[PDB]
Design a binder for these strands. Structure first.
Ligand SMILES: [Ca+2]
Ligand SMILES: [Ca+2]
Ligand code: NA
Length: 342
DNA sequence: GACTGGTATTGGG
DNA sequence: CCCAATACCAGTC
């Protein structure tokens, strides 16, 4: 197999530079303004300038405006970003019908049948970079390998405005030498569990008892990591079928008052039914994020489809149940639907 | 902040 | 009860 992964460079900030040539040269910081007080929220994307002056994704807007107050700070236009994103995906379709969109700024292409080797893979990568820059004035980073995981790591190594091949020999090396924390799907918490079991590199998963690994990180991760380590991972490039669909929103003020919370819950439900489109769910869970950012949820599965009306009615009973059983103020509220009708 | 997927824990016909 | 249903834990972007 030959896989080509495309990752748009510092996407949201870059798109603002397109829509406003002026931002040329300026550090640019796109934020999620949560609306709870002035500058409440976090940084979504920071361009290269902002980064070298110590600004990065996921830090508070205020903590960022300390570290460098000089930068230009903008708000999300998810919809505008989505239009650009969607168009770029359509351009990628031109190069391969076997596409997997992983997020608003990332996609895999299976080009096993569109090229013969990595020399030609690299060349097509350049065509893609040219074509996207030409149509959308957005640079991307392209990673190329024998599977999805190593294609993604290639791009991580080559960011920004890059292109990289990890060949069969570099795969073997990385299996032994790549910090396992840098493998997609492995976060700080898993890395720390892995490290205490003596597992710092992919290859290490081959010298521990499976049951111990599975017992510590669950079966899916253990198998995932082992199949990579044996150089046998080969999941097809295919857009994944969602098992749940939902929405969760931050409230402007923390609360336990149903009549304050409902508007948010009901909007979240309505937008969830727009996303559901034609799928009818049989399960609903109401999810509350408390004022200390703990996550509580209550749910119910029905023996039949749930209409939006039923969702409204049932959501309220589930929110009441949460309010009965946890005394904290609620900060975010939302819902998750699942168990769709075949 | 806003999502979803996986799974240890749990309770009801 | 013990397995489908929970209500968490976790990673990503
Ligand atoms: Ca990305
Ligand atoms: Ca990116
Ligand atoms: Na990681």
């Amino acid at each position: 197999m030959i896989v080509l992964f495309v990752d748009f460079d510092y996407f949201y900030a870059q798109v603002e530079e397109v829509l406003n040539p002026s931002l040329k040269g300026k550090p640019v910081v796109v934020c999620v303004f949560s609306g709870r007080f002035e500058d409440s929220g976090a940084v979504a994307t920071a361009n290269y300038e902002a980064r070298k002056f110590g600004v990065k994704a996921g830090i508070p807007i205020v903590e960022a405006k300390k570290i460098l107050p000089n930068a230009v700070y903008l708000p999300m236009r998810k919809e505008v970003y989505q239009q650009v994103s969607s168009r770029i995906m359509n351009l990628l379709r031109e190069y391969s019908e076997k596409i997997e969109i992983a997020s608003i700024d990332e996609a895999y292409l299976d080009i096993s049948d569109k090229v013969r080797d990595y020399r030609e893979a690299y060349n097509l990568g350049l065509e893609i970079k040219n074509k996207i820059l030409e149509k959308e004035k957005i640079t991307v980073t392209v990673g190329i390998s024998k599977n999805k995981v190593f294609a993604k790591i290639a791009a991580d190594m080559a960011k920004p405005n890059g292109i990289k091949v990890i060949d069969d020999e570099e795969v073997k090396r990385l299996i032994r030498e790549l910090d396992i924390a840098d493998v997609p799907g492995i976060g700080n918490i898993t890395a720390e569990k892995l490290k205490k079991l003596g597992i710092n590199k992919l290859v290490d998963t081959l010298s521990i008892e499976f049951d111990k690994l599975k017992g510590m990180i669950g079966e899916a991760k253990a198998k995932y990591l082992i199949s990579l380590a044996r150089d046998e991972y080969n999941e097809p490039i295919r857009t994944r079928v969602r098992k749940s669909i939902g929405r969760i929103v931050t409230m402007k003020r923390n609360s336990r008052n149903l009549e304050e919370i409902k508007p948010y819950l009901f909007r979240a439900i309505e937008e969830s039914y727009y996303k559901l489109d034609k799928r009818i769910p049989k399960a609903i869970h109401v999810v509350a994020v408390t004022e200390d950012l703990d996550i509580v949820s209550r749910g119910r599965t029905f023996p039949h489809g749930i209409s939006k009306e039923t969702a409204y009615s049932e959501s309220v009973k589930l929110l009441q149940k949460i309010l009965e059983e946890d005394e904290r103020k609620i900060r975010r509220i939302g819902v998750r639907f699942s168990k769709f009708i075949e």
